[PDB]
Design a protein around this nucleic acid. Structure first.
Lengths: 106, 124, 51, 50, 19, 187, 168
RNA sequence: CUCUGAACCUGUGGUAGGUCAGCAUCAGUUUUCGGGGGCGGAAAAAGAAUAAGGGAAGGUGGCGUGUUUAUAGCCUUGUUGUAAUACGUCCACUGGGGACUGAGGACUGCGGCUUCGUGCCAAGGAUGCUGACAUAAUGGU
RNA sequence: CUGCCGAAGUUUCCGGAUAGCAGAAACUCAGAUCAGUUUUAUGAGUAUGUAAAAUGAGAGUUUCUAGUGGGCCAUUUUUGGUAAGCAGAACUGGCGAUGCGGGAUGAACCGAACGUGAGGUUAAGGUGCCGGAAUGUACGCUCAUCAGACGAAAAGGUGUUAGUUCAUGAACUAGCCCUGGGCGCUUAAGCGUACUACCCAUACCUCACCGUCUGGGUUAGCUUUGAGAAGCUCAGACGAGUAGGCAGGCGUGGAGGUUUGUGACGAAGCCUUGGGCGUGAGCCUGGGUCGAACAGCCUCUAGU
């Protein structure tokens, strides 16, 4: 089944936050394989999605997606800042996100 | 100039949820020691003039029109020159007979009616 | 008038408006050659390489 | 303005070259060059209003 | 103003802080 | 770098605090972590140092002695255990003494940021958690220190069988001409 | 990083002093502004020459003529401490005068908990003779047979699969 | 005769309105890599390299002792055609990536192209090309 | 209900007359003055003072007219001290009318002072995990069995690290260790220094919008029509707030006028996880319930 997955695995770590104030509009995403802020420049502007399933079979489907884009790197270790169309729920801390390769400049 | 709302939540009076005797209509707190008047962290917001909305888009419904209250056919004909700016809103105490006459007249004038389906049935 | 402020260091059209000289500027002119007279006497070198 | 701007730029280049050449000859001959003390200064406020 | 300081008969003397 | 669904860590030679902080961050990152050989963890400091630290802890609570319970306590203090997120992250950690049968046949990784040989200065006294636990109440040290040889002997036999099996393909590799005919790609 | 500046200064000429004397010091500072301030402070406390009545006549950074040749530098320093009066001399082996001074500052700030302003250097010299070397550590570094293993090897990608070799 | 986009047949003629999404040309703000080019310094210092001398962490020979290029060479010095590089500084030099914003609403103005142009333009604030949906899309409670 | 202005919190005599702080009115006035500012030099004694230079701001007024007539944190200078702490003056500012980032938490410590937002960038603090951010780089000290991170203190250290002096040693100097927020950390996740990266405040920048203030334009009302001139329009700056002051609005009962107003084809009221409008007081509306009256606008009135 290794003829698929055009995307890259990622994890939703947290929102942008200070010690005591959280900003849910921007989320901190750890793209796996990206290990520094210079490698995070490749994934800037790429589409990222959160894919989950819900009980109702609305649209005749069991899966729904929240889309987003990668805006800028966060820190030195390769984490990025992502803004989603809808703010990611706080329950999705440590959940998985998919980073496509489009819009591609390669 | 699409419609932008600086805020959609209402401003509820402090402690209005705790007490049933206290209504939720906004009241400016007067206590000096009250943290809401001092505007501490985590406390509820207060009506400020900065929350005011754009003058051009003020009073505008989400479809871009302003609700104009209408009580008879004379009020509908007033919006002949302003059908792109105003929507007719029939008053609540206008009977179902007059509501029908208003709705047919507004249809010829090209005037949107906010509550054109109230108190009436359809029969095709 | 002046709804938007445009930077002359980024907008080249605004730069030509404000400065009617940037058209003929010639920044990088060459004044040196392969005959540079290194100018440091032995007196100054001795003072520099002292102590 | 074009002529004035051209004149100003040539003045800056001449003054900058003059300082370089005068320092070069002072260094080579043996004396020391003391350039003019600054007359224009740029001040930035770095502390707040409290 | 800019001026020159001749080193003839006025050679600089190296200084050291007092121990 | 990359994550797996379950990560098995061989805690032999790993410092308690360095490994716990890495594990706690991985638990909050959304990963299931299994730490085996929790009795082989190391703590900087002499035997008497952490002895008095644990003896003072006994003076204070449910005093746990098992090495995994020591490691589980260290990881828990590095988690937001007062919230649902911290509790959920805690339940993804499985710390055990030794290597149980479900895990001795699975690959075990190590954390270089927590290894004693790469973090402690040579010639510094250290206290093993298993030895430290043995005198403070833990009574299963001898039986687990005896069973490890049985696991090691079985595992060593498996490696020899795997190495002997691998020799056939390794010889067959250079035997096939196509291995070097198109080896210009670096493979 | 630190830079070695040679600074020549003199007092403003007056009717009493048609021509004043030139005073030159080689002092280390990260930038020229620090060097000029340190030069005036040294002059004020050595020659009692005020900055207001004095001016800087020259300043030039000095590069090491032989940065690719190992050398031994002996530094004479003055320590200002709680007592405020100490004379110390240290020897450092490196390739540039700047590195030795930086090493000295790191050593004293670590061991003695000093500061840049308190520490003042009387002199830095290059020990060109093995017999002139006083410290035993530097004498070892000049022995004919330097032979020692690699020290402090210590060598994201967490969860390494195999144990580190950390050896030859 | 004109008019009624008048009714219907004839057209199967031509254009087709509200939420989302994508890209491209731009303007404002900003962030992040890269390519060059001048000008400074001891007109960098080094170094490669012409070369005289000296010592040893004494190499090589000679007899661990002392040596002076041996069958290694090191440093110093002037010195071989000049340099190169680094750092500082500047270019009204230049090539990409990302994000947020689109206020205003005929025309004026300041400019640049243009032989002149109801001319064109990145020049007193976004436009163009598309795609998805009414029993859905999108948002609110 | 919103908007705008905004103290004093104390000299002097002595419950007040005051003054002073903050506004209103009546002025005149840039070819003129004013200043919790720095000066030039000499006058007097580096300070102090002087008349006339730099910088900024247009300033001076006269009249009357609300509120206050304390303290706390203390710093600094400073007097007496007295086992020693401590107490006494002045001074300095802050809190007092002030939210926000940090300080584990914090009424007075470090940053920073506030309209509603988007983006960027920082301050003070920080980047092992909790916790956003380098388990970064380089050079050093220490292993503490009561480390360190924040008087029992004199000393003792066959505890040391570096150096200075005299010179085989001796002592001396300085610094680490012992005896006398959590988890955890030990060539650190402690301490010292240097250097790049990174995290984020209501702070700074750019833009949008709200309001206030200030300045300007606008009539032979031009086919740009945008003259409720009480309108329209352009620009810039600013936004804490107790007492107090000043504007504009929302709602209720009744009255005069008006809507050739609404109503048994359902008024008023009430209910409602229906919808919408306004920064807000509030208002409009759908559905349900209900059964006879009621409202908008201009003005008047008050047991509002």
């Amino acid at each position: 089944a290794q003829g698929h997955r055009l995307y890259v695995k990622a994890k939703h770590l947290s929102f942008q936050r200070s010690k005591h104030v959280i900003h849910p509009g921007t989320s901190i995403v750890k793209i796996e394989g990206c290990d520094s802020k210079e490698e995070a420049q490749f994934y800037l502007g790429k589409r990222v999605c959160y894919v989950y399933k819900s009980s109702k079979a609305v649209r005749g489907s069991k899966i729904r997606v929240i889309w987003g884009t990668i805006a800028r790197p966060h820190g030195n270790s390769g984490a990025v800042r992502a803004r989603f169309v809808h703010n990611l729920p706080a329950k999705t801390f440590g959940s998985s996100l998919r980073v496509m390769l489009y819009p591609s400049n390669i | 100039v699409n419609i932008i709302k600086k805020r959609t939540k209402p401003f509820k009076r402090h402690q209005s949820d705790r007490f049933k005797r206290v209504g939720e209509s906004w009241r400016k707190p007067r206590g000096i020691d009250s943290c809401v008047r001092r505007r501490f962290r985590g406390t509820i917001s207060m009506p400020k003039i900065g929350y005011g909305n754009n003058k051009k888009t003020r009073y505008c419904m989400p479809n871009g029109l302003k609700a104009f209250l209408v009580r008879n056919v004379s009020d509908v004909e007033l919006l002949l020159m302003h059908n792109k700016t105003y929507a007719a809103e029939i008053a609540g105490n206008v009977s179902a007979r007059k509501r029908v006459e208003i709705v047919e007249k507004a249809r010829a004038l090209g005037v949107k009616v906010t509550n054109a389906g109230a108190k009436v049935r359809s029969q095709e | 008038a002046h709804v938007q402020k445009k930077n002359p260091l980024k907008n080249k059209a605004v730069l030509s408006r404000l400065n009617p000289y940037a058209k003929a500027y010639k920044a990088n002119v060459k004044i040196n050659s392969e005959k540079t007279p290194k100018a440091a006497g032995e007196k100054f070198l001795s003072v520099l390489h002292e102590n | 303005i074009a002529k004035r701007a051209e004149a100003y730029e040539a003045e800056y280049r001449a003054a900058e070259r003059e300082q370089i050449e005068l320092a070069r000859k002072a260094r080579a001959e043996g004396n020391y060059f003391v350039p003019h003390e600054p007359k224009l200064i740029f001040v930035v406020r770095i502390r707040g209003i409290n | 103003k800019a001026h020159f300081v001749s080193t003839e008969n006025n050679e600089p003397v190296t200084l050291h802080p007092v121990a | 770098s990359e994550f797996q669904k379950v990560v098995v860590i061989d805690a032999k030679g790993h410092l308690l605090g360095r490994l716990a902080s890495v594990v706690a961050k991985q638990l909050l990152g959304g990963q299931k972590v299994v730490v085996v050989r929790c009795e082989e963890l190391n703590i900087s400091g002499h035997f008497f140092r952490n002895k008095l630290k644990y003896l003072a802890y006994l003076r204070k609570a449910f005093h746990f002695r098992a090495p995994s319970r020591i490691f589980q306590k260290a990881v828990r203090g590095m988690l937001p255990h007062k919230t649902a997120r911290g509790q959920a992250a805690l339940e993804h950690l499985q710390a055990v003494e030794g290597i149980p049968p479900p895990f001795d046949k699975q690959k075990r990784v190590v954390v270089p940021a927590a290894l004693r040989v790469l973090r402690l200065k040579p010639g510094r006294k250290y206290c093993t958690v298993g030895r430290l636990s043995s005198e403070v109440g833990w009574k299963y040290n001898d039986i687990v220190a005896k069973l490890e040889e049985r696991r090691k002997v079985k595992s060593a036999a498996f490696y020899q069988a795997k190495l002997a099996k691998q020799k056939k393909i390794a010889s067959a590799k250079e035997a096939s001409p196509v291995n070097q005919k198109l080896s210009q790609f670096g493979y | 990083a630190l830079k070695e500046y040679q600074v020549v200064g003199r007092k403003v000429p007056t009717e009493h002093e048609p021509v004043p004397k030139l005073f030159r010091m080689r002092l280390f500072a990260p930038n020229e502004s620090v060097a000029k301030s340190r030069y005036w402070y040294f002059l004020k406390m050595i020659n009692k020459v005020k900055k207001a009545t004095g001016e800087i006549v020259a300043i030039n950074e000095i590069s090491e003529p032989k940065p690719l040749k190992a050398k031994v530098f002996g530094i004479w320093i003055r320590y200002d401490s709680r007592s405020g009066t100490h004379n110390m001399y240290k020897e450092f082996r490196d390739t540039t005068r700047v590195g030795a001074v930086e090493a000295m500052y790191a050593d004293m700030a670590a061991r003695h908990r000093a500061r840049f302003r308190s520490i003042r250097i009387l002199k830095v010299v290059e020990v060109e003779k093995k017999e002139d070397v006083r410290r035993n550590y530097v004498k070892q570094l000049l022995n004919p047979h330097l032979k020692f293993p690699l020290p402090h090897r210590r060598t994201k990608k967490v969860f390494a699969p195999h144990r580190p070799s950390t050896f030859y």
